Design a protein around this motif. Structure first.
Motif, PDB file in Angstrom:
ATOM      1  N   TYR A   1       0.858  -1.169   0.000  1.00 29.14           N
ATOM      2  CA  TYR A   1       0.000   0.000   0.000  1.00 29.14           C
ATOM      3  C   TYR A   1       0.897   1.222   0.000  1.00 29.14           C
ATOM      4  O   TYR A   1       1.929   1.260   0.685  1.00 29.14           O
ATOM      5  CB  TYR A   1      -0.968  -0.001   1.194  1.00 29.14           C
ATOM      6  CG  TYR A   1      -0.358   0.062   2.576  1.00 29.14           C
ATOM      7  CD1 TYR A   1       0.304   1.204   3.023  1.00 29.14           C
ATOM      8  CD2 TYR A   1      -0.494  -1.007   3.463  1.00 29.14           C
ATOM      9  CE1 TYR A   1       0.815   1.286   4.322  1.00 29.14           C
ATOM     10  CE2 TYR A   1       0.013  -0.937   4.770  1.00 29.14           C
ATOM     11  CZ  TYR A   1       0.666   0.213   5.190  1.00 29.14           C
ATOM     12  OH  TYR A   1       1.167   0.294   6.474  1.00 29.14           O
ATOM     13  N   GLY A   2       0.524   2.203  -0.809  1.00 31.71           N
ATOM     14  CA  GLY A   2       1.307   3.411  -0.894  1.00 31.71           C
ATOM     15  C   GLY A   2       2.707   3.105  -1.371  1.00 31.71           C
ATOM     16  O   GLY A   2       2.900   2.479  -2.410  1.00 31.71           O
ATOM     17  N   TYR A   3       3.691   3.557  -0.612  1.00 29.95           N
ATOM     18  CA  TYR A   3       5.070   3.311  -0.967  1.00 29.95           C
ATOM     19  C   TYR A   3       5.649   2.318   0.042  1.00 29.95           C
ATOM     20  O   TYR A   3       6.850   2.310   0.285  1.00 29.95           O
ATOM     21  CB  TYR A   3       5.863   4.631  -0.946  1.00 29.95           C
ATOM     22  CG  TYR A   3       5.553   5.612  -2.083  1.00 29.95           C
ATOM     23  CD1 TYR A   3       4.492   5.390  -2.973  1.00 29.95           C
ATOM     24  CD2 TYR A   3       6.331   6.765  -2.266  1.00 29.95           C
ATOM     25  CE1 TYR A   3       4.219   6.287  -4.012  1.00 29.95           C
ATOM     26  CE2 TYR A   3       6.064   7.669  -3.300  1.00 29.95           C
ATOM     27  CZ  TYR A   3       5.009   7.422  -4.166  1.00 29.95           C
ATOM     28  OH  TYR A   3       4.740   8.311  -5.184  1.00 29.95           O
ATOM     29  N   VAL A   4       4.793   1.471   0.607  1.00 25.90           N
ATOM     30  CA  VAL A   4       5.234   0.496   1.608  1.00 25.90           C
ATOM     31  C   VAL A   4       5.220  -0.984   1.191  1.00 25.90           C
ATOM     32  O   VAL A   4       4.158  -1.574   0.963  1.00 25.90           O
ATOM     33  CB  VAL A   4       4.396   0.628   2.907  1.00 25.90           C
ATOM     34  CG1 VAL A   4       4.969  -0.277   3.990  1.00 25.90           C
ATOM     35  CG2 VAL A   4       4.386   2.083   3.382  1.00 25.90           C
ATOM     36  N   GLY A   5       6.417  -1.565   1.104  1.00 21.03           N
ATOM     37  CA  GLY A   5       6.581  -2.972   0.759  1.00 21.03           C
ATOM     38  C   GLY A   5       6.398  -3.454  -0.674  1.00 21.03           C
ATOM     39  O   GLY A   5       5.642  -2.877  -1.460  1.00 21.03           O
ATOM     40  N   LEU A   6       7.112  -4.529  -1.006  1.00 21.19           N
ATOM     41  CA  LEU A   6       7.024  -5.172  -2.316  1.00 21.19           C
ATOM     42  C   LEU A   6       6.486  -6.567  -2.030  1.00 21.19           C
ATOM     43  O   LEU A   6       7.168  -7.381  -1.415  1.00 21.19           O
ATOM     44  CB  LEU A   6       8.404  -5.262  -2.964  1.00 21.19           C
ATOM     45  CG  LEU A   6       8.978  -3.916  -3.419  1.00 21.19           C
ATOM     46  CD1 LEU A   6      10.479  -3.999  -3.553  1.00 21.19           C
ATOM     47  CD2 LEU A   6       8.330  -3.515  -4.734  1.00 21.19           C
ATOM     48  N   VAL A   7       5.259  -6.835  -2.462  1.00 20.46           N
ATOM     49  CA  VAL A   7       4.632  -8.124  -2.222  1.00 20.46           C
ATOM     50  C   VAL A   7       4.141  -8.833  -3.469  1.00 20.46           C
ATOM     51  O   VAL A   7       4.059  -8.253  -4.555  1.00 20.46           O
ATOM     52  CB  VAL A   7       3.431  -7.995  -1.260  1.00 20.46           C
ATOM     53  CG1 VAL A   7       3.917  -7.611   0.119  1.00 20.46           C
ATOM     54  CG2 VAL A   7       2.445  -6.950  -1.788  1.00 20.46           C
TER      55      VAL A   7
END
Ligand SMILES: C[C@]12CC[C@H]3[C@@H](CCC4=CC(=O)CC[C@@]43C)[C@@H]1CC[C@@H]2O
Lengths: 221, 219
Positions: free
Chosen positions: A100-106
């Motif tokens: 979400y947003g600029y948080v994490g690569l999943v």
């Protein structure tokens, strides 16, 4: 379920161009920031480019000016246009969705491989690996298959079409002068070979090659 | 362009023990909307990388509580309370403070187990390859630990340095052992010019090298 699947990789000559695709599913395609991350042989990870829901795109220094990341919101596909491909670009390319947003690569996909080189595609040579006679017999026996002189990666190896899966060790390919070599070993009860057949199946997509090599005990007249 | 340094390169740990991996940023982390853009990933053998910790200490859903993240200003650490066999693989820290986001160089978490010597096997060139002018002698060294190992090829007694190709498998999660392949490639002409062929394996587990060989003129 979120799912991202890469495709488009392959062998390309330097200066050449190649466009990678990443099929997205299980979510609002335009809602999240999508990225391309590559992994080189030294297994190091390098962020390549990202495109946020805003449409804004960003690139890494090495990429800047040569690559172009884009998306086709309608088809739910993320692309990576590559050009002026340098040897330095050879790597496994993955696409991922931000949490979400600029948080994490999943939900990274399995990845697609990009080999940039001048060497030409070469079919593998598959050689059977048989022991030394019989004198040296315990309950188990180890056999093998040598796959050398092919290019580019990858190649797949199975034993007995896949029937034989336990007791197998397939080694990562090594590149020695524009050609790869790989081997795979398998251990089976010495009492089942060569009574029953032991065959290794080798496939090389890049050359549409498919070979099955039966392991036969050494000549010995 | 920031620089993210990860330590150590390899981390052997005994099951039940604690794992500690750290990352230092060549620059103070630039908070994002307050939180710190610090994240940790694990790439298990033959699998794509996966998210473990984000925001520096937040656990992505599904990740065991055995995993925890901490740290501040350039210094960040990943901690695994009690390592389990399945934790095996390469960990990476991620610093997305500024464009471009950066990955640490990775840390291979290695499961420590009882030393085990390799089961060695040697294979002479195949008829088919000889018929083609090539000659490759192969030696498999399977299921051993630690990973450090020395393999020397001797032809008729003399050590051969040129023309060898070694390859190791990642650590197997089932038994915590490594396996290795050593291939000595020669010309058909030469192979037939000698008689004995042997691969000598020196492994911590023994000052006595394990030796396997055969004579080109036999069965
Ligand atoms: C790659 C990423 C989406 C793109 C983000 C990145 C964080 C840093 C960043 C800053 C920008 O100005 C553009 C978007 C980027 C480049 C995020 C880290 C995890 C997420 O998936």
């Amino acid at each position: 379920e979120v799912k991202l699947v890469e495709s488009g990789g392959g062998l390309v000559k330097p200066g050449g161009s190649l466009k990678l695709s990443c099929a997205a599913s299980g979510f609002t395609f335009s809602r999240y920031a999508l990225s391309w991350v590559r992994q080189t042989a030294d297994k190091r990870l390098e962020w390549v480019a990202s495109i946020v829901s805003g449409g804004n795109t960003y690139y890494s220094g090495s990429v800047k000016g040569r690559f172009t990341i884009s998306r086709d919101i309608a088809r739910n596909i993320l692309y990576l246009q590559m050009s002026s491909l340098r040897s330095e670009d050879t790597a496994m390319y993955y696409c991922a969705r931000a949490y979400y947003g600029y948080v994490g690569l999943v939900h990274w996909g399995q990845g697609t491989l990009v080999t940039v080189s001048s060497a030409k595609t070469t079919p593998p040579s598959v050689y059977p690996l048989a022991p030394g006679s019989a004198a040296q017999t315990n309950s188990m026996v180890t056999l093998g298959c040598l796959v050398k002189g092919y290019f580019p990666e990858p190649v797949t190896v199975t034993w007995n079409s896949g029937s034989l899966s336990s007791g197998v060790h397939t080694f990562p390919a090594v590149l020695q002068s524009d050609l790869y070599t790989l081997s795979s070993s398998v251990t089976v009860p010495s009492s089942t070979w060569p009574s029953e057949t032991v065959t290794c199946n080798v496939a090389h997509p890049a050359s549409s090659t498919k070979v099955d090599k039966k392991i036969v005990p050494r000549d010995c007249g | 362009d920031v620089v993210v340094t990860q330590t150590p390169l390899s981390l052997p740990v005994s099951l039940g023990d604690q794992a500690s991996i750290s990352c230092r940023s060549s620059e103070v982390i630039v908070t994002r909307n307050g939180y710190t853009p610090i994240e940790w990933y694990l790439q298990k053998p033959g699998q794509s990388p996966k998210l473990l910790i984000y925001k520096a200490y937040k656990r992505f859903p599904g990740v065991p509580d055995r995993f925890s993240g901490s740290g501040s200003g350039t210094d960040f650490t990943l901690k695994i309370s009690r390592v389990e066999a399945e934790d095996l693989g390469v960990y990476y820290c991620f610093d997305g403070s500024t464009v471009p986001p950066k990955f640490g160089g990775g840390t291979k978490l290695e499961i420590k187990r009882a030393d085990a010597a390799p089961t060695v096997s040697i294979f002479p060139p195949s008829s088919e390859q000889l018929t083609s002018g090539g000659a490759s002698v192969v030696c498999f060294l399977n299921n051993f630990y630690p990973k450090d190992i020395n393999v020397k090829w001797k032809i008729d007694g003399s050590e051969r340095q040129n023309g060898v190709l070694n390859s190791w498998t990642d650590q197997d999660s089932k038994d915590s052992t490594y396996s290795m392949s050593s291939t000595l490639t020669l010309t058909k002409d030469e192979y037939e010019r000698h008689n004995s062929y042997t691969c000598e394996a020196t492994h911590k587990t023994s000052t006595s090298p394990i030796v396997k060989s055969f004579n080109r003129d036999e069965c």
